[PDB]
Every structure is written in structure tokens, then in C-alpha cells.
A paper describes a structure:
We showed by HPAEC-PAD and LC-FD-MS/MS that RgGH98 is specific for blood group A tetrasaccharide type II (BgA II). Fragmentation of this species showed that the deoxy-hexose was linked to the hexose at the reducing end, as determined by the characteristic fragments at 431 and 449 Da. Together, the HPAEC-PAD and MS/MS analyses confirmed that BgAtri was released from mucin following RgGH98 hydrolysis of the Galβ1-4GlcNAc glycosidic linkage in BgA II.
Incubation of RgGH98 crystals with BgAtri produced a complex with clear electron density for the BgAtri in the binding pocket near Glu 411. RgGH98 makes hydrogen bond interactions with each of the 3 sugar residues present in BgAtri (GalNAcα1-3(Fucα1–2)Gal-): Tyr 289, His 330, and Thr 371 with Fuc; Lys513 with Gal; and Gln 305, Asn 332, and Lys 788 with GalNAc, respectively. Lys 788, present on an extension from the C-term domain, forms part of a hydrogen bonding network with the GalNAc N-acetyl moiety and a ring hydroxyl, forming a stable structure. However, unique to RgGH98, Gln 305 and Trp 528 provide additional interactions, bringing the terminal GalNAc into a location conducive to hydrogen bond with Lys 788. Gln 305, Trp 528, and the GalNAc binding site are unique to RgGH98 as compared to Sp3GH98, Sp4GH98, EabC, Cpe0329, and BACOVA_03433.
Numbering used by the authors: 49 to 893
Write the structure that this text describes.
Amino acid sequence: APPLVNLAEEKDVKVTVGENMDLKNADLLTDGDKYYLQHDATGNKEGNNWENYQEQGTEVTSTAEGKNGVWVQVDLGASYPLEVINLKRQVYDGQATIGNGNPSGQGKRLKGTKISYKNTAIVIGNEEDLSDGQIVYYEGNPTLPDGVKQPENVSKPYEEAMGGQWFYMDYANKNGLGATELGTTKEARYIRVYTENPKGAAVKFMELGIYGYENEQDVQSQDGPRRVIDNEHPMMIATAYSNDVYEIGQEEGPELQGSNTVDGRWNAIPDDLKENNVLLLHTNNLRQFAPDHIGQAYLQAFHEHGLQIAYEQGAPIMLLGLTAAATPENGGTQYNITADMDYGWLDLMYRMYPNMQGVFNTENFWAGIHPPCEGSAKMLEIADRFGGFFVWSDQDHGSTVTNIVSNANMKKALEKHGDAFYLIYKNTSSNQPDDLKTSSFFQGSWLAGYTGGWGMLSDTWAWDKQFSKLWQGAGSYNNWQRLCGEPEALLGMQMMSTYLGGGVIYTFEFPEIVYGTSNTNSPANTHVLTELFRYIVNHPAPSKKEIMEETKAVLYGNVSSDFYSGLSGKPTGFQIYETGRYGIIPVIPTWGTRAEVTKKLIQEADKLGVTPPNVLDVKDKNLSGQAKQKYFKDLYPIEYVGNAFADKWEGTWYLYNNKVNTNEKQHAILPLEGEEESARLKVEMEPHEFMIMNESGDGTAMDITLNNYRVNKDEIIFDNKFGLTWTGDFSPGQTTINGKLSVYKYMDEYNVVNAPEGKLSPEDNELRTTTFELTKLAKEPKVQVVKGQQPDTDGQPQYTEPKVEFNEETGKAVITIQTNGWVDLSITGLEFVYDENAQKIEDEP
Ligand SMILES: CC(=O)N[C@H]1[C@@H](O[C@H]2[C@@H](O)[C@@H](CO)O[C@@H](O)[C@@H]2O[C@@H]2O[C@@H](C)[C@@H](O)[C@@H](O)[C@@H]2O)O[C@H](CO)[C@H](O)[C@@H]1O
Ligand SMILES: [Ca+2]
Ligand SMILES: [Ca+2]
Ligand SMILES: [Ca+2]
Ligand SMILES: [Mg+2]
């Protein structure tokens, strides 16, 4: 257990009241329950109806005539450093009803009249009569203990809330309501709460949480950030979705999609990569549409439970803070139990769990604009106060970033806390060609210093919108089938392109396919993600300085989707390029006027010691399409010839075949280093392959890593040879739809890395050819596999031994290999001589 605890709950406390007061059911004050839900075992429903909100609690009643004010006091049994207090009293005058929310007819919200209590005060101390009392909070005019002085600044009443009220130990910080620095404590044994009900002599106290430490040695402090996210410290996020089943008080940790667990996902990660990974707790459709009491209870219980399990395993955590515009801010939806977030609870999670790091937001604007901005503004402030971070994932059709800045509170929060805020793409709607513009916006936002970084969320839902079987269009298959169809190597190609643009966050869905099921690692995870991510961890991406230095043009405004065609590549929806010649092309959205953005970018460049790029409005005559190619070709020299993607960056060539789902070979012809400048490497690749090449520099050697890992889904998924049920319906006794269960069955039984007996190795044994032509050489070069992807349990090879043909009379050496997966090749004994016929590395006339 972490050092910050609810002492009121953990200790054997004594509860008392003043003379002429009656005390009833004292144990309810410190039972950890603020909601008194009764039907947890049946999904918080009795029949088809959500259970009512029924408020129970410790009742204190004045029996002194004409004097309704009461107090209740807790003796913790010893003096402890206290940091936070949470007080909740009866919220509703009478009983609240369950009425219509947002969206109308599905969302549910409590309705009724809320109580605003008066003459509320909180006093703590180390004498039982509190003659040494210190004021934590004071509203109205309750008579304090003898020896405790009236405070100068007095609070006014507030409306009681579902989560209660939160108090901290700095009276000068908003009269005790203002959240303090981690570890701001006062030592006390006795805690007294004063309250007067506006109607009558009785107050029901539903909970008094008193959070502190066992001793002063355990008191925490804010000594720096919880993590660094940058080119030298990249971060992979894996989403841990609730399976939508949970019961408050259950012994076992929350079940995740695909028979996964929080601890299980963490322990599946290779040890050397754990420091660059985080788990995102996502509530998914847990208690979806539920009214306030059920929503808040389940949001809190699910996240706390995940945090605790993570804490025991040493796993850092992000929480889903906001999706589907489901926020407690005015106008919010109830599409998710994030609707019932209590910002006091979110603060508590950072104080209680040292492994709590970040907040995640995605997919809001289809459902509402300003509510998710208002909520994100508050959560960004909280995250950054604790040295944490905030990630916002979305595709930008053109108004995503401008919507964010159009909200005054979010704009202001970004100005103060922007260094802890990260924008990552999300290519779910792959059929809209906004992938490349999104990356440009997000890179541009970072480059100019409005945000702390950028990155990627690649979603296999992208495949659903366009394709099915290999080389085929969507056809008439179920969407859960098409979800499974994406080539594994393509995920690596996407990672490579994000890396080259100085991206620092990497995340993938559908998690049960890309990371795995049943706490195992999937084929994608094992043979692509973990391999390439290890390269990214050990070979830092370009810094902001390096991006700035290589960038000759920055655009301003809402760049056209189709701008990239005939430049870096046609937007495919899959976040890949035809060439690396121009980089990502940073486009700064309208964070301010062109002049304001220009000044900001110049300041950022100056700070890095770099020449500022020129800023052009997207509408500039030079970017028209006739003149755009001329303008960009004059700024950025050609590096290689051919139709494959290639980028040379700091001595290393990065390549891929850039066809998403068309079976075409592509090539790249590279000028090689050394004394002989006519030296050439031609690479030819079939689709779904990426490559990293490093020359020795003296023209004698080179190392090549290639990866073209692709599982064939044609028979198992699309022909459906095992007769799985791919539909959106529930089957008898199931809380998960058939389509999902089928994905899980595929991953558990039919596509298993190192498949044990009775399970199938992945369908990955059909190999494809990569060829390398080296010219002009005097003698045959030497090739060998340093390391290669090993067989699954079926014994079938993932590569064949490389073959070298060398022609004496011409310079040409041809190296051929067949792979499905990764190999590290080493080529040595290269003796280049002058080649008058060497391919010219230049543009066409
Ligand atoms: C009902 C259901 O099973 N949903 C799962 C599914 O949800 C995603 C798909 O519906 C997809 C179709 O193209 O659209 C996505 O927006 C949707 O994502 C989910 O909902 C949005 C609002 C966000 O909260 C996302 O974080 C969330 O994933 O697939 C996801 C995983 O891709 C989950 O399993 C859902 O349970
Ligand atoms: Ca209680
Ligand atoms: Ca380059
Ligand atoms: Ca080198
Ligand atoms: Mg195999």
C-alpha cells in the first residue's frame, strides 16, 4: 500500500458529538462508502432500471432548543501528518429522481433540489478539546473551541456535491479549498466538523475521509517531473480497456478486454522496455449512461483498483479523463462514466499513487466542443501541478486544434502548462484523407512551442474503412473481421515515419490484436512493435533542434488535405509517405495571428541556437500546386532516386515500400559513402517492409535490418475456416458481443506466438524477396545473417540464407533474401571502383 492513506478508514477511530447532540450510526462516517449502492452484484440495476440514489450516513441531531448547529469529531488514536480532507453530507433535500441526460433517451442524470449547508467549519489539533485547534475551513459563524481564534477570511456556503468537498492544509490558499503542493501537511489526532442544516436540527454525514501518513518520514514531496517524454525518453502507451464487467468490492482486479489484466499486461512487456511504457486505464462502456451516483462510484472504483494493482507491480499509469464529451462540466454527455469525474478525486489519485502519471483525452468533438475543453483545462492544470502529463488524441479535419484554442480556459491553460501537453494523431477514420495534415499540425504545434511534443495512435480500425483480405477492398465482411486484417509491418512503417518527424509517443489499437490477449504478446507485438521500439529507445529521434535545423519552410493555417500529393505523398489514411525528402512539413494552426505564430517560432528557434524557418501562409502563391513542386524542390535537395520511401537522417537510411494494399514492387537507389562517389545501392522491396541501413563510412561495409512481418488472415479471418461468429449481437449469457469474442478466440487459439500443443502458430511462413544491387565493385562482397527471426513451434523458417551473384565483367553484385519477419544482415569486403554509368541522383527535367 502507498504511503498516503485514508487514516479515518484504516485506524480504529472514535467518533463523538457535543453535549445536547444525539449520535446515530457512527461507523457510516468512516466506511469508505459515499454512495450506498445496493445492487452492485446485478450491474446496479433492479430489473431493467438503474437503482435509486439512497443517502445513508452518520446522523447528528441537536437537542438544544433554538440551536440547530451540530458537530462531529473523529479521534484517530494518535497524531498523524494530514494532507487532505473529504467531507460529504446528504446532497438532496428529499430523494432525487433519475431523469433524462445527454444524449436524450439514453443518458441518465439525477434530478432534485440540492442542499447548501451553512456554519461549516473544520478544526484539527492534538488536544481532545481542541484548545490547540488549527482552522482548516470556516464558513458562517459557528462557535469555535475556546482558544481557537476567528480567521480573518471567512468562506461562503457551497452547494453539496456527489463527491463531497475537498480541503487542504493551507488556509491562505483559497481559505482551505485550494489544492496544495504534494506533502503539505499538518500533524493532528482530533478532527472536528461543524455544520448547520438550513432545515432542522439534524445533519447526515455520509463520509469524512482524512488522508495522511503513518509518520513524518513517509510524507511525500514534489521533487521534479514524474516522467520525461522527449526524443531521449520516448513513451509507448498501451490501452487497458475494461471488459465492462465490475462489481464494487470484488477481490480480483478488473477484467480487461481479451482476458487481460493490469498486472498481466505489465509483466508481458520485455524488461528492458518497461521504463519506456505506460498503461492507460480506459473505462470503455463500464456502466455506460449511468446516473451520477453509479457513474462516480464506478469511475473511482475501477481506476483506484487498476492503480493499486499497477502500484504493486511498479507500473506507471494514465487514466482516461475524457472521451465522447462525457464530462461533469455543463453540457457534458454521459457516453462514458468520465461524465462523473470529481477533480478532488483526480488530485487525490496523484497524491496517493506515485505511479499515477497522466490523463488521456480522445474522440470528443463529434459530441460536443466546449465542455470537453473546459474539463481538459482543469485536468491539464492538475496533471502539471504533480509533474505529470496530458495526452490528447484526435484526427484533425481542420477544426480540432482551432476548437481547442477557441476555448479561453483551455487556451490559457495551454499557455501556462503546454509543456506537459502532447497531441497524437488517430487514423480511425482512415477514409478521410486527413492523416498527413494532422501530423503536420501536431508537429508544427510542438515546433513553435505551443505544446510539449507529438506522436501517434495507429488504429487497425483504419483497415476496416477501406480493405479486407490482402490486396482487396472492404467488400461485405463484418467490421470485426476487417479489424484483424492490417499488415503487422505497416505498424512499423508508421512508427518509423513518426520517429523521423521527432515524434515521441507511440500507441496502437485494437489492443488485443496489436499487444495481445490472455496476458501474452501478439505476433505484431513480438515481431514488429517491440523490435522497432527497442531501436527507438536506444537511438533517440531527432530533437526539436534537429527538426528545426532541417526545416526550411513552415506553413500557417488550415492546409488542404491534398497538399501532400506530388510532394511527400498521397494521403492514404495510414500515416505514411512516398518520400522523406521534405520531412513531415510542419503546419502551424491558428493558435494566433500569422505574426504572433511567427514571433513564437522565431523565439523557439533562437532558444535552440538555430536559424528560424520561413513561415508561409497556406494560401501563398508559391504553394499553389503548379509552383509548389518548384518551391519545395529548390529548398530540399533530392537524396535518392525511386518510388519507395527513403530518408537519410544522421548517417542512417530509413526505407519502406509505401503501398498500403496494392501488390507492387518499389525501389530506392542510394548514393553511398566512401572515397568512391559513383558507388550505388539499389534496394527493391515488395509491400509491407521497412528497413534501417548504416554504412561503416569507409565504403568497405554496411549493416542492414529489414522487417516485413505479415500474418496471412485470408483463410482464418475472411474465409472464416474455423466458423467463428462475426456479428454485433450478444449470445446467451455473454456480456461481450460475438465479433469481439471472435477476435479474442483468433488471438488465443489460431494466431499464437510459440503456440503450445492444441494451438496454432501464426500463418506467417510464406516468404517474400528483397534484393540489393551494389555497383560498381571489383570483387564479390561477403554477406551474413548476424541475427534473424527464429521459427515458431511449427519449425518453419522466417528467412532463407542470403545468396550472392557477382558479375565479373560489370561491377554488379546482387544479394537476394526471402523473409517474413526481421533479419540483421552484415555486408563486408566492399571494394568500389569508378563507375561512369552510375545512376544520377537528381530530379527529372
Ligand atoms: C461498442 C464497442 O464494442 N466498441 C469498441 C470499439 O470502439 C471503436 C469503434 O466503434 C470505432 C469504429 O470505427 O470507432 C471508435 O471511435 C470506437 O472507439 C471507442 O469509443 C471512442 C468514443 C473512444 O472512447 C475510444 O477510445 C474507444 O476505443 O473498439 C474499441 C477499441 O478500438 C473498444 O474495444 C470499444 O469497446
Ligand atoms: Ca460513508
Ligand atoms: Ca533526409
Ligand atoms: Ca555510418
Ligand atoms: Mg512461422
